[PDB]
Ligand binder design. Structure first.
Ligand SMILES: OC[C@@H]1CCCN(c2ncnc3[nH]c4cc(F)ccc4c23)C1
Length: 167
């Protein structure tokens, strides 16, 4: 039993809710919140800008030190950093950005990072400003992630379409 509330169950291990991931993180304080990161960990907008703003820019300060030491992530890759006031840990995952021309096949590699964590609160990778089809992202999530994932979808209209079209 865990503290996630109001989710629709899609499969054995995938759950979905129309929610603001920032507000959901503030309430649940999950072990892991996933960020929709880019390779530079520049958290300017989308999910990343919102999560970083909620940490009062502490996420960005930590991220800048990470990049100065380690260099950029790979598209499809991830790193574990602090969750600050939102979660124990933040898993920064880089899905392909279609608006940069990145290969959508890398979306499966991106979701594989979730399997290193037993339970996660996450957004749909490569959705939103990353330019992928969120229906496709949900399908890849369900077919790739085997650990327990609680998906927060900010847009109510999109949430209803994702549920209604789910096979
Ligand atoms: O849904 C399409 C976009 C892009 C893909 C996923 N994004 C989110 N997903 C879950 N929670 C979210 N809180 C947010 C707060 C913001 F200021 C911006 C985006 C989100 C956000 C929204």
């Amino acid at each position: 039993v865990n503290s996630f509330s109001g989710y629709l169950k899609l499969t054995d291990n995938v759950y979905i809710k129309n929610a603001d991931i920032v507000e959901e993180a503030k309430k649940v304080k999950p072990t892991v919140v996933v960020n929709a990161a880019n390779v530079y960990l520049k958290h300017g907008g989308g999910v990343a800008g919102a999560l970083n703003k909620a940490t009062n820019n502490a996420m960005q300060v930590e991220s800048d030190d990470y990049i100065a030491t380690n260099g950029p992530l790979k598209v499809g890759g991830s790193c574990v950093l602090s969750g600050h006031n939102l979660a124990k840990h933040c898993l920064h995952v880089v899905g392909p950005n279609v608006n940069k021309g990145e290969d959508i096949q890398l979306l499966k590699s991106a979701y594989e990072n979730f399997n290193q964590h037993e339970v996660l609160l996450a957004p749909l990778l490569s959705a939103g400003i990353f330019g992928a089809d969120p229906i496709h992202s949900l399908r890849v999530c369900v077919d790739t992630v085997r650990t327990n994932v609680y998906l927060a979808v900010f847009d109510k209209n999109l949430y209803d379409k994702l549920v209604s079209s789910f096979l």
